[model samples]
Target chain A: SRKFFVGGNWKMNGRKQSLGELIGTLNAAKVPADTEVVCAPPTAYIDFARQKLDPKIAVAAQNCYKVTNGAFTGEISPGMIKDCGATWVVLGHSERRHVFGESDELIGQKVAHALAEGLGVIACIGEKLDEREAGITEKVVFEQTKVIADNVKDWSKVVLAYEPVWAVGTGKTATPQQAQEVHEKLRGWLKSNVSDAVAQSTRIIYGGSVTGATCKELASQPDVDGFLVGGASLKPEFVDIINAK
Target chain B: RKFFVGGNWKMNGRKQSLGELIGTLNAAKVPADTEVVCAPPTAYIDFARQKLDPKIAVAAQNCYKVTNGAFTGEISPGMIKDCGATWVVLGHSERRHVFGESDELIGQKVAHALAEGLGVIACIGEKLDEREAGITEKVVFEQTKVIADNVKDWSKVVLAYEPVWAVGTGKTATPQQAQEVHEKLRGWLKSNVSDAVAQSTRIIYGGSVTGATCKELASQPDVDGFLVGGASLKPEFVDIINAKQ
Candidate 1:
């Protein structure tokens, strides 16, 4: 069965004081053991976060290049993430889809690489505002989803976070019903194209301006397994979202 | 004026190899009095800083514009600085050509990085075709001018002139060829920006740099130091750092 997962994508935020405070909070909070909590700290701070984070929580790198190691500059490799004691990496978030070019194929490849090193993968996928407005949100989302699913060899090591481009960081969210509508269809596609086993087993999460206030409703949706917390991640409210389930 | 030498380790180290990379530097007889910095993969910056000679600074190869938010896969400028990095390399030819970062966006990054109180290795260069077409000055100047417009303080920025054609090609611009551009750039700065910026700002050369050739390049009046790529990962980088010595 898919584990209930809540990831705090501390995307490019946190100084020493703020990070220590966040870590302090995570340390004191008693999260349910059934729910898997991941703190995806910025790449520069993974080692710092990993060292300070409670053993109950897993640490994640915000991103990694597909290579095991090379001269891709400004990129971390899967080996680097694994060595930093981070067991996970977030790939193909919507900001990278700013064009939706170099979108799916490379992201799919990165997911595969993260798996090779035995690191868990939170492979993100979504459609742009234009694509959704074009009345092809399903087509866009499915294509993005298909790319990751095809390259991925093991479903267990992956969490698929579906975050819409418009909704993320616009201080907006994909309304619970709206998020479920897409998550439901994508889960159905996963069943049809992949298999019943894969669809039933994978933990599909909702992202995009995820917050404690909106998370309970989204978490209750059948297909929305958990959340990939965005703006709320650096605050105490992040704990509220973790207990949301 | 302190000459600057930065090693762009460029996404090439895993943790195991990082120990060796650090050992290589820690054991080396470093050249005294020059500004020596190495750009390790972002994940290893802290470790490298801890192990490296305190005199040598650690630089992040790149970072995002915003301090925080939903821009996943990007380490922020503030995050880089908070992690104890003294410098951030922005707009390398790899980022500009390979990743398609616009000149405008790079200008914005320089502004943000400066505001965050981080020194910037603001890379500027032209492609082989542009150089072959002989608009080398035209291309580099446009790139440089964009950065000048955005930053409040040019003191915090160093211009790295890396010809995209030479960067991993094993072919370098002949020392004289590299010097010609540096002289022209210095003259351009004198005429357009100011005599102080023209004289004080470092205009370092990059691309296929090696210990064997670094000394001759260092002898040229306008070529201040180097932003070494491949050689940066090896033992001989110590020799490049000592070229003036």
Candidate 2:
């Protein structure tokens, strides 16, 4: 079975002092021995977070550019991210996609680059509000996944983070049944498009406004591997989300 | 005097690769006269300092508008200074246009960097449309005016004139085009800021700058230095560094 993985998307939050305390809480929190945990602080705090996080807890970069290096200002490249000691990169996150106007092709390029450079990737994909409203959720997810599958042959380096854009940061979450259906469909799509072995081993995690209170029920779903948590990941309750399964 | 060449790696590098890159740089026999500085991703600044030669100073790719505080996902000038980096690059074209940073905001960043005793590489540039409309001088003047308004001393700052159209596009301004802008910029500095400030300040050029293009651009009297881009990553960076003779 794929390992249970929990990631904190500390998106656009945490001051130095506050971050210190937040890391301290995570360092002291009782994590499940079987679960793999990682947190992506804002780029400004990656080092601070690294220094304070326990060895068991890995850290992630919230985003990265496709080119390893160049004139792209205000962007942290994958080479530089690896240089900074971060092990994971969250790519194509909904905010990065919907809010920042990241294209799937561009995201695929970043995914291929990150993996080639040996950084683990949490490759996010999901339907936007309009797409979901239009009942093309599967098509949206499939297109996003196809871009990666077309570019990246190795699924071992990637984690599929299913973050429905409509639910992120909006406090709205898909019900357990709703999430399970998508997860199951995605798993089938992976098997059909890639390989059965890859589909079975790859972890497909849900991301959005996941909270400790809701994670346990969500975790009970057969296909729901774990979570890529947003705001709740910044709080003490992230422990609960990590241990939910 | 020889030129100074700095690379604002921005929030880019991580622990996994910084040491190797620094070691390669250290072993390299850089031109004795050129001053070299590389800004690691903020997380790895301290790491770079530990491994890098004392002669090769470190820099912060950017800092916050405020010296310190509750702004999450931002590094403060005081914090950057504390990290032992003596230089900070502010208002790079990417920050100016893509991130919604205004000239006023950059002025605030420059003032704060100076207050903390950090040298500022203040970047100014014009977009393709602005350049085509023949407003390049006007655009650059508006940006420099903010710095002139805020900064009392030019000794702590170096101006980088990066034409936005040339950045990452493989397009480059002709030597004539660059010299015209640089000459115009010097004239503006002398008129609005002060002759002492204008004469003393280093006006550098940036954007898809290659080693091949550097010699001609550097020959222009007003073009004092270079803030290199893609070429800075390769061995050719050494040539660009030596272009200012």
Candidate 3:
């Protein structure tokens, strides 16, 4: 059975002080027993989040450099993240691609590096507004998935997140049908490119402007494995998102 | 007056190597008259402090503008202070150019850092092109002008003049070039800030600074100290610390 997974990308936000309260709230909230929950706080708050977060709830870094160590200042390495007690690392998020100039090659390298360090990865892939409008969403996301599939042999440690660039942080989530379409397409692509068992077992999550109110409808979609939330993760309503089913 | 020396181990050193560096510094006999500080990457600051000597204060490589809040991927002055860092190096040339940090933003950080009662070694310098264009003095002056405008007290701050052209490159500014810029900086401080502030402020040189080059550069009257870079990682770092005598 594919375990339900929900990860929060606290993209470029949060401070040391508020992090404690945020994690505290998560710990106090009653999440779905069967679902696996993870929150990727900013690097600054990773340590605090680790310390404050409930043992059941895992923590992750929003992004990491491919290299194990070097002169890439302000970048936290995967080893360092793991050493600091973070169990997962989120790579190839839309913001990282669009805002931070991270290329597909770089994301592939990061996935390879993190997997080597035995860290689970939430690999994000999605098409932009233009690509979707141009009807090349499958083509765009396929290339992203192939980059990781080519580099990584083991698919057990990976969670694929389909976050359409147009929807992310824009208050315009992909419609249930729209999200299901992409999720189903990605699963088919993975099965064709990788192994059928790997594709069947892999969790394909959805992201972009995901709200607690909308999560129930989205969760009902067969192909929609779970969610990789954005702004809604910071609010108390995030508990509702986790238990939307 | 005593000489001040700082080593920015910028984004370099793993956990094991960092421990070795600290061991080397702790075992070595440093000069009595020199005030030495080593700025390690934030991850190792606490670890370095535990193993490093009490006499040699630890510094954070960089800090955020806010004292505390939800700014992800940023270290706060309060966190640095809580971690037992006595000083923070702000607005280093790399942070300015590579990370897109501006003088005004750095000034805000300086203000916040000082308010947290943390000492600051604020870095300022110009590029080779700017220097060759006869605007090195102008460039450095403008950098200092922003900090001096925002920083109320000058005593808690040290000015580290690291020419971008010289950093990480084997290019060393000739004694005349170093002295010329340093003297011009002193003049600018006196004219724009105050004579008392000018006299008390320690103007140090950085960039590809090696043990072999320290004595000559330190001999300049206006060059009150040395901010060692690559050489700071080695046993030769001790020799650079003694150059002021």
Candidate 4:
């Protein structure tokens, strides 16, 4: 059975004091029984957050490199994340692709390598504003998903996030119908391209401008198994989204 | 007026090995007068800093151009400093050539790191082709100039000369080869950066330096210390620390 998942992506935010303050609220919240909670603090606070937060909540690293260990500077490896009591890594995030110039091939390599190191993966995929305007959203998402499909041997260990670049940080929330359309298409792609087992089980989460008010409706959609909260993830609003279903 | 040695563990070290390594270092007799700093992967920085000898400083292997935002898989300078890390290595050859960081970008990163209150280990070097073409000084000069122009505070900056061809290749620069670059770099710091920095700045050699070579290498007038890679994670790192004149 597929369990609902909620990931708090505290990207490039939260210092030690701020982290503890955030964890204080998270620890006090009553998480849904059927939902899996994952708090992805920056690598700097993952271990600390893991220890301070609820035992049921999982800790995830924002990113990791392809190699298990090597001379790559400014990069962390899955082996290091695993050693830190983190079980998941968020790969192929939009910032890494658009701002930092990570290629699909490289993200695929990282996802495959992380799985090889026995870490769960939240392999993110989305279309840019231009791609959407040009009506090539499906193509862009398909290509992104295809690379992971080819490399990720253990599809069960992976979660996919649909974060439209245009909606992210623009305060633009894709309507429940709009989000459902993409998730359904992606689910169909998974069924045709990967397998029925993976298609039926993989938690395709919606990200990008998700708020508590809108989350309940999005979670009602068939392929919208859960949410990958970004800005709201750092707020008490995240608890509302987690319990939306 | 003190020699400085930095160990760049890069993307290596699990919690178990890192703990043992730190335990060994804690028990070892490190030169009191020498300023020792080691870079552990970001995931391990706080843990390493907590367990390391009080005299030793911890540094991040690398950091991003931005302080905080949606930049996934990237650590901000503020985050690095917040992780209890006092130093960060910028423009290392691995980051430049391997990860496609340009001189312009590295300069931006240096400026950001200083502003965030983290010390900067600014790395410069030439490729084997550039070295063979006898343009090593030119390449090194441009890289150093980029940092010198961007950084306002030289007090927090340490220059590391890591010839790309020599690094991790098991091939070291001849003592004379290493000295020429270090002395040349020293001369530039004096002339262009500042007289105080020129006289005070630590220019460390970092190319397959071991305990054996570290002793002879440290004897050079301009070779202030070393930025060790492989040997730093090994027992001989203690020897290299002692090799400081």
Candidate 5:
């Protein structure tokens, strides 16, 4: 069985003082022994958050570049993330895909490079509302996952997050059943494509509007290993979500 | 007018290495008349700004167009300033070519970064093909126009010309070529904007800039500074910074 992962992706949010306060709250909160917590601050605050947060609660960069180093401006590499004491990176989030126009190939390269540089990856996949309504959610999700899957040589360093684009930050929570159905299929896809060990070991977490109120049921799903929380991660209720398991 | 030199660390270096570099910069004897700024990746802005002497300012490699929002994996100008960094680099060739940032998006970023009180090193350049096709001015002029249109204050902006073909490709543009572009850009600014802005604003050069190449490049009448990429991390960057003197 996989260990539950509760990753708070404080996406493009938080200043030093406010983030320090948030870190204080998280450091003081007690959660289930079985749960693994990771906080993703914006790249700017990765070092600050890493230094302030309890080491037990790891720090992850919201995103990172594919290479070790180069002339790539406005991008941080995995080595830079690790230097800042962040052990994990959140990649392939819908905002990266749809909003920022990161292609699957680019995300795959980033996933491969991050893992190679010894960073755990919360690789996200999902379909838009239109794709969901078009009944091709599975098709889109599978293609996205395949790109990530192709680049991952070590499954242990990866957590798959099924964050439906339609649900992220829209206050539209996916029902537990909806999340479970996707997670289960994703695991099966891994089993069939990658090894059975990978399918069994890799955590398949849900993102997209996960909050304290909805986290319990989502955690109850057999295949739902944890969450990659967005806006709610900045709030106190995040502790309740962390204790959901 | 003071000579300017900016070191864009560009997704490179760990804490120890950067701290060492900062120590070198802190103690180095460069021209007092020169203005120096170093951009570590966003994660290290606070760390770099804290450690470096106030003489050398810190800059974020890039930032989002807004103050803050649901833009996952993006940092805003407000966050950059809050971290104690006083400057930001925008529209670098990598952001344009590698990351697919359009002129419109970059213009909006320029507007917001200035509004938030951060000085901007706004870059515009032409690709190898564009230069080969003899549309170098056409391309850069268009890019500069968009950036200029968004800028309400030229004093807070540095215009950098980094040819996409030369960036990180170990190819340095000849002084003649770089000077030609710089002169043309200044003329464009003089005709389109105000003569005062054209005369006073700093126009810098990037792309494979090194200690060996810096002196010749910096001598151009229109070349007011250097945006050193890889060389920024090296001790020789000090040599480049003092080249104007």
Candidate 6:
């Protein structure tokens, strides 16, 4: 079985004092030995989180540019992420894809570069509300996933996050059945396109308003290996989700 | 008059390199009368703020328009302030051409950053093609008009004219070339905003700026200072900062 993984994307939120408090809470929380937890703080707080959070909990950059260093203003590199003591980066997030206009090509480049730089990647893919309503959720997600899949040289360093754009921070979440169906299909896609070893070993996590209240049942789903939490990750409830396994 | 110099480190530097750079800056004999700021990539904001001397201000290369929310992979002005960084670079050319950020979005960011109490290094520029097409003045004037329209306090803003074609391409505009745009921009501010706003505001030149070329650029009457790019990472940046002397 894959190691149970949970990631919290704090997104574009939090200040030093509040993030410090959250770090303290996470440091004191009793995380299960079998579960792996990572916190994706805003880039400004990555070093602070890495410095204060318990060693058991890893720090991740919410995003990064594809290159190591250059004149791409306002963007950070995976090498810099690594230098900041963050071992992971969240790439191709729904917000980056939809809100920031990151193309599938750009995200694929980022995934490849981040992995090459030796930082683990939480590669995100999901369909929009319209796509789901149009009955093309699988088609949309598979197309997005293909770019990331094609760029992957090592599956062990990657965690696939399926965050439905419509559900993220809308206070709506996919039911366990809805989430498992996508996760199962994704694993099949990986199995057929990449290899069975990758499908079996890579963690396909759920994200989109994942809370302590909803985490247990979601965790119970056979294919729903873990979560890429959003809002709840900023609260004490994140510990509960971490312990959902 | 206090001369302004900004170093946009862009998507570069690791902790070790940045720490060393900070050490060099901290120990350098910088002019007390010159106002200097350096923008490190977001991941190192807190680290740079904590380590750098209080006299030399730290800045984030970019930030989201809002204070906080579910906008993944973006930082906010409030977070920059919380990290003790008092400034942010907005509307850089890379954000315009490479990232597809429109003038409207950049204006919103400018308004929000200024309102949030972070000083704005608001950049505007024309591409090589625009210049070749004899529309440099039109392109930059329109870009400046958008940024100027968003400002309530001119004291908190510095206008940067970085000809997009010159940035990272190693093509320094002749001093006369830089001054012409600077003069036109200052005139725009005088006519549209106010003489006081135009006179008080610093119009800095960017793109292929090096220590050797900075003195001449700084000599232009409308050229209030320099926005050093690649040279910002080098010790020679000190010379650029003190060019007016």
Give the number of the best model, judged by DockQ. 6
How would you encode candidate 6's per-residue C-alpha lDDT over B1-245 as one tens digit per residue?
A: 46899998988898889899989999998898799999998888888989999989998898888899889888889999999999999998889888999999999999999999999999989887787788988898899889888999899999988878775466667889888889999999999999899899999887667778788888889998878888999999998987978
Report the lDDT tens digits of candidate 4 across residue range A16-57.
Answer: 888888888878886768999998988877777877888888
For lDDT, candidate 4 versus 6, the one ahead is: 6
For B124-208, candidate 1 gives per-residue lDDT tens digits of 9888778778888889999988988887677988989987866556665798988898999889888988999899989998866
TM-score of chain A of each: 0.96, 0.98, 0.97, 0.98, 0.99, 0.99
CAPRI grade, predicted model 5: medium
- Per-residue lDDT tens digits of candidate 1, residues A114-231? 8988999998888788888899999988988889988888888988999998888887799988899998998999899989998999999999888878888898888899999888
Instruction: Give the higher-TM-score candidate: 3 or 5.
Output: 5
Model 3, residue A2: distance off in Å is: 2.2
lDDT string, candidate 6, A141-171, tens digits: 9999999999999999999999999989998
lDDT of 2: 0.80
- Over the stretch A1-245, how does candidate 2's per-residue lDDT look in tens digits? 88998999887665667778888888888577899899997776676678788989998998887777654566777777766678999988877776556788888898888888889999889998999999999998999999988877578878899989888888998889889999999999999989999899999999878998999999989889999998897788998898897
Give a tens-digit lDDT track for model 5, residues B1-245: 57899999987888899989988998898688899999997778888988999899899999999887888789999899998999999998888887889999999999999999999999999887787788988899999999988988898999998878665456557899889889999999999999999999999887567777788888889988888878889898898987866
In model 6, what is the error at residue B84, expressed in angstroms? 1.0
Q: Which ten residues in a row have the lowest lDDT in candidate 3 chain B?
A: B66-75
- Clash-forming residue pairs, model 1: none
Q: List where candidate 2 sits over 4 angstroms from the true fold.
A: A15-17, A44-52, A69-85, B1-5, B8-37, B41-43, B50-57, B62-120, B126-135, B142-158, B163-179, B189-202, B207-225, B229-245
Model 5 chain A worst lDDT run, 10 consecutive residues? A26-35
Runs with alpha carbons beyond 4 Å of true place in candidate 5 = B165-172
Model 5: per-residue lDDT, tens digit, A122-224?
Answer: 9999999999999999999999999999999998899999999999999999999999999999999999999899989999999999989999999999999
Q: DockQ each candidate and list the results.
A: 0.75, 0.25, 0.29, 0.75, 0.79, 0.91
Instruction: Return whichever of 3 and 6 wins on DockQ.
Output: 6
TM-score (chain B) for candidate 4 is 0.96
Segments of candidate 4 deviating more than 4 angstroms: B167-172
Task: Give the lowest summed-lDDT range of ten residues in model 5 chain B.
Answer: B164-173
Please say which candidate is ahead in lDDT: 3 or 5.
5
Tell me which of candidates 1 and 4 scores higher on lDDT: 4
For B1-245, candidate 4 gives per-residue lDDT tens digits of 58889999988989899999999999987887899998998888889988998888999888888877876667788878777789999999889887899999999999999988989999989888888788988899999999988988788989999879775556657988888889899898888977888998888887768877788888989998889988899988999899864
For residue A74, what is the lDDT in candidate 1?
A: 81
